[PDB]
Design a protein around this nucleic acid. Structure first.
Ligand SMILES: [Zn+2]
Lengths: 50, 115, 84, 97, 50, 52, 133, 88, 52
RNA sequence: UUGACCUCGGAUCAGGUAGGAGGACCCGCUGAACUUAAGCAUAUCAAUAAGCGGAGGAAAAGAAACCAACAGGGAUUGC
RNA sequence: UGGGCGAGGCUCCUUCUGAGUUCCCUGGAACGGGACGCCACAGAGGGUGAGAGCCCCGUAUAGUUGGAAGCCAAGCCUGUGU
RNA sequence: AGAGACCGAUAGCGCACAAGUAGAGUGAUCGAAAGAUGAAAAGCACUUUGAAAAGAGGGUUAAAUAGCACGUGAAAUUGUUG
RNA sequence: CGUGAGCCCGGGUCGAACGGCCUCUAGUGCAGAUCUUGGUGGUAGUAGCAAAUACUUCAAUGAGAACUUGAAGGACCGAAGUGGGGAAAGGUUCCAUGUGAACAGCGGUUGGACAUGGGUUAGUCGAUCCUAAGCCAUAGGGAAGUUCCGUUUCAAAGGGGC
RNA sequence: AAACUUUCAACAACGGAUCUCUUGGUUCUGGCAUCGAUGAAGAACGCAGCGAAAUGCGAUAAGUAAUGUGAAUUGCAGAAUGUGAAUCAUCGAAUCUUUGAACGCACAUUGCGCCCGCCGGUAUUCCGGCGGGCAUGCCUGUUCGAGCGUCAU
């Protein structure tokens, strides 16, 4: 029963290991399409980045 | 062992109930496999003894305040706040004297109409 | 480790003067004298009068605080107020 | 002539509860009849003539009987509502008929 | 910091007691749907917000 | 329900060089942020001509 | 067809009630018929099953196997019968769960409460039979 | 230098924990909660935010006393004990 | 500290000269109670506390 | 001097009451603009949204300082 | 014209309710196919190892146990006018 | 409490799941993704190769062409073979 | 088979429902919307993994060692330090054992990672006390009102003794 | 000729469409009227033999009493069972931490008090703890007062 228990614990980690999370506390959702990179236009005056 | 039944508790008067509570709390404090079952049984026994003591004390207080005008707030009926603030039945059914005379001499009659 | 003031503790709580006792009991002096005579309350003398009251005299009379509280619990006060 | 320039969709009243409301009214009528039995479920109403020149050809039921009508029929005004007769003190009898 | 209030220390104590993986006997219950602790917190990933 | 597809705060990102001009869910830290909203062609949006 | 307005013919509500019923309701749900001998003896068709009853399995792959009920596992709605087991990989024996409607009760674990249940059911059946007769 | 360099200077707190609602929304200098409006007697709610109303409306918490009220109404706010019940 | 020494004296009949207390990171209080030199801590732990 | 009235105060005096929540519907107050008018200060949206106060199981209204002009109807509410 | 009983009825929770697990084939398992029956004021719904009126809970109608609190009510006793 | 010529997991409420959760924001607030092994865990004894993960035999099951990546298993895209 | 949209059959996979005809009904037919959501390519084993001078030998551990450890060397920070301690902020990252995967853009036996345990002891150090700039009650006055002003006032605002 | 690129086919990948299902939504209809100073809604912190969450509960803490049913619960371990199991149903008796309209003053503090009792520590004096109390506006009554406001003597 113990061996079955750690086997279940190890099989519970497969999706987060494929997502390459550092443990089960790694639940950060990053900005894949940030607004500052995907909106607005660049003029001759002040720009938002160099 | 360590289990005290409520039916045994209900027959006992106040002072030996306090004695039994004292022994239960004392042996629990000395206890602080089968010890887990024993401490669980001690906890539930203490809960039962406290319940029985509280119930008997409240019964005595109700008997004491049975014929007094003002009761303690915990012994007063709960109902709701609005039900407590509602007019009493006697005051709500109280009626003026002219209306009383009218209802005395001309009430709603039982009648039928021939077809 | 809390700092403590001087006049708060000790004989200052243990004894109170006749003026303070009368003002605490909310009484006139004749009523206070009658109550003291009946209950058996007598002044007593503190070890150090300056410890109890800062402006204290050989003339002034101190009383026991528990005696004053026992006079407070005395039920003759309600009779006095009713008769007044 | 379409009056749909306000926020009319906020106060559209449908009437899918028409059969349910009819059933509710019938149940209330049964309860009232059972409570008032053996009395009739309604009061006695007079015969009055409709006002205006359009409707004065037709008679209908009024609110209640006048005090002069009750006095001429010999029923006291305090007994009359207690035996199923509606009483109306505002109406007058301007004509004999 | 080292200087902290009692309310702060109490809430940190609750966070410390919550920071654990699920017991292995949980997964063997009948009709169990819990595979890992989905509210696991780490000091570098997500802030407590105190 | 008359509120379906509309219980969200979304503003269009304007004319640009990258993305279509659909209103997009504001904020960050979740998958919903930056996704299209309110359209009948959008996932989790309002249907065309909702039934009354 | 149902007539009473308090009766629902909703499949969704019925399945929710069945799969979230409390334990006292699941006891009545987990009922088994009596054998012909016990039916003629007690004038009772079915009773809720309990541990200590002797049952015969009349449906499934373990048909005609007879044994005593060792556990009434109400959480998976099954019962466990003596010698009605299987072997795992390791060779250990694990019980096979049988639904109580697939068995028939051949001998009752009987006491004062079961006798009272049988008495009420029998008296009610005779009262209904006399009233409708 | 209004971006990354300026973000390194962020080490104070505009808001602390509110005693009434528990959120980290109590403005430390104004001593007024931006969420629930403590220390005002009323709880702050507005009709322009149905979401904010339903985040904290009745039923989202424990219902410690109010959940027992319909049963007491159903049995008619009775008092006492069943006849023949064991007790004092 | 006063309640702790009173509780020890009344329940277990243990005399202490001083008590230092801390509150642990899990939220429970820990008390170090130093005993009087006449009584032996090893003897008390063996008999009463059962810590052997 | 002694007491009475009147007005105004004190008390951890005796006994009570209010606050907050909820607010779909209900009673009031306060009060927009987008929109529609070619634009637009009348107007429309709208005596609406948002904001504030106060109730109940319904609320409100209600037993004519009414309608009428008739051979007169007869509190209120709703279809 | 005041008082007091009141048969009986209504509202609410509680005990109980009809009939195959008969035979053959397929199938891991009949709730499938075939044969013979039964119940039905119940052939609504759900479960049970695949489409089950009769395996189980329920379903229909009359009732039938036990308890509490109200309401209505045919009638019947009485005081009589200060 | 009962229903539907409604939707059937990108639909239907944002939420069929420890969902107003996780996460983000100083804050007011913003706000998801995510259902399905099998009738029954019977969730692979034992041998063998590997440091292990695993593989191979051999087993369970009606089926592993259902192996807790789990019903069915499309297309884009990829490997081997012809 | 049909001009066609399509319809029908065979073979394979699969496991619980589905179809023809006549009417009824609609959230009913996609290649485009820099469409929405999800998934997947070429680019491409490519760009790149080049600031902060720098690494080497032996032994041990281990399946496996440039980035583990011990010793032996060679160097750097050079006291405004790559040192020793604190305030803010974080909250257990601290310590000891053990460790598959994931993470540490190379590896990894190592780790601030993962798993289980342990660790913070005060009359004298701080908080607690005082007041500063400032803020909030009370009297009273505004405001339809949520509330605004007011902090010494146009207040019977209290202490002590015989 | 191979390799490479492309095309076609079978099998295997990737991915999760399609089909079938549904303890969920959505809409309609019927019935009912019941929150709070006798402390609500909300918040925080705790409570299980072995739980982080969800659920339930409050130091009587995955609960006590009472009524009913009548033999479980179950992932493991350990025990109890005719006053009798149960993560059962019902529910009229209770318990109900710190808070919150939140009420001794405060609160970014587990800070500082006042009154009356009790307990423990040598204790009339000291130190800790506990019990009951001490918010504001307003109403009625009580009692104590103030004012050449005013009456009689
Ligand atoms: Zn708040």
């Amino acid at each position: 029963l113990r061996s079955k228990a750690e086997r279940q614990a190890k099989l519970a980690q497969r999706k987060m290991n494929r997502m390459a999370r550092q443990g089960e506390a790694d639940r950060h959702i990053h900005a894949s399409m940030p607004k500052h990179l995907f909106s607005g236009k660049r003029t001759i005056g002040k720009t938002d980045r160099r | 062992n360590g289990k005290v039944k409520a039916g045994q508790l209900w027959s006992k008067n106040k002072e030996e109930l306090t004695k039994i509570l004292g022994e239960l709390k004392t042996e629990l404090s000395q206890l602080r496999g089968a010890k887990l079952n024993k401490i669980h049984d001690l906890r539930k026994s203490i809960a039962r003894v406290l319940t029985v003591i509280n119930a008997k004390q409240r019964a005595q207080l109700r008997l004491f305040y049975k014929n007094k005008k003002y009761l303690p707030l915990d012994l007063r009926p709960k109902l709701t706040r609005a039900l407590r603030r509602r007019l009493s039945k006697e005051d709500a059914s109280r009626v003026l004297e002219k209306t009383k005379k009218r209802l005395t001499h001309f009430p709603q009659r039982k009648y039928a109409v021939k077809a | 480790g809390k700092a403590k003031k001087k006049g708060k503790s000790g004989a200052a709580r243990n004894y109170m003067t006749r003026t303070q006792a009368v003002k605490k009991l909310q009484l006139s002096l004749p009523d206070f004298r009658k109550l003291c005579i009946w209950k058996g309350i007598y002044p007593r003398e503190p070890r150090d009068r300056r410890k109890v009251n800062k402006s204290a005299t050989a003339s002034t009379t101190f009383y026991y605080t528990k005696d004053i509280q026992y006079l407070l619990h005395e039920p003759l006060l309600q009779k006095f107020r009713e008769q007044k | 002539n379409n009056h749909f320039r306000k926020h009319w969709q906020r106060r559209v009243r449908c009437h899918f509860d028409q059969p349910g409301k009819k059933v509710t009214r019938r149940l209330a009528r049964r309860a009232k009849a059972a409570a008032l039995a053996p009395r009739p479920v309604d009061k006695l109403r007079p015969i009055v003539r409709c006002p205006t020149v359009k409707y004065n050809r037709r008679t209908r039921l009024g609110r209640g009987f006048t005090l002069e009508e009750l006095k001429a029929a010999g029923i006291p005004r305090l007994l009359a509502p207690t035996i199923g007769i509606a009483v109306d003190h505002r109406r007058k009898n301007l004509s004999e008929e | 910091p080292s200087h902290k209030t009692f309310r702060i220390k109490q809430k940190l104590a609750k966070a410390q007691k919550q920071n654990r993986p699920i017991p292995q006997w949980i997964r063997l219950r009948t009709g169990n749907t819990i595979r890992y602790n989905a509210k696991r917190r780490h000091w570098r990933k997500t802030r407590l917000g105190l | 329900s008359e509120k379906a597809g509309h219980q969200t705060s979304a503003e269009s990102w304007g004319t640009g060089r990258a993305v279509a001009r659909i209103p997009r869910v504001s904020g960050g830290g979740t998958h919903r942020a930056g996704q299209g909203a309110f359209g009948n062609m959008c996932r989790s949006g309002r249907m065309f001509a909702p039934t009354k | 067809m149902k007539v009473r307005p308090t009766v629902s013919s909703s499949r969704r509500k019925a399945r929710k009630a069945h799969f979230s019923a409390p334990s006292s309701v699941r006891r009545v749900i987990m009922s088994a018929p009596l054998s012909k001998e016990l039916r003629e003896k007690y004038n009772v068709r079915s009773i809720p099953i309990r541990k200590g009853d002797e049952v015969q399995i009349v449906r499934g792959a373990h048909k005609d196997k007879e044994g005593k009920v060792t556990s009434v596992y109400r959480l998976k709605y099954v019962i466990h019968v003596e010698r009605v087991t299987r072997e795992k990989a390791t060779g250990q024996t694990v019980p096979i769960g049988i639904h109580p409607s697939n068995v028939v009760i051949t001998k009752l674990h009987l006491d004062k409460d079961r006798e009272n249940i049988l008495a009420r059911i029998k008296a009610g059946r005779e009262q209904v039979a006399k009233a409708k007769g | 230098t209004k971006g990354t360099s300026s973000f390194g200077k962020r080490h104070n707190k505009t808001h602390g924990l509110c005693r009434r609602c528990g959120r980290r929304s109590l403005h430390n200098q104004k001593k007024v909660c931006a969420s629930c409006g403590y220390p005002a007697a009323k709880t702050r709610k507005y009709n322009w935010s149905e979401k904010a109303k339903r985040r904290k409306v009745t039923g989202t918490g424990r219902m410690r006393y109010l959940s027992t009220v319909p049963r007491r109404f159903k049995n008619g706010f009775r008092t006492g004990v069943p006849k023949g019940a064991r007790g004092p | 500290k006063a309640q702790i020494k009173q509780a020890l004296k009344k329940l277990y009949d243990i005399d202490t000269v001083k008590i230092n207390t801390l509150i642990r990171p899990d939220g429970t209080k820990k008390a170090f109670a130093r005993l009087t030199p006449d009584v032996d801590a090893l003897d008390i732990a063996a008999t009463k506390l059962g810590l052997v």
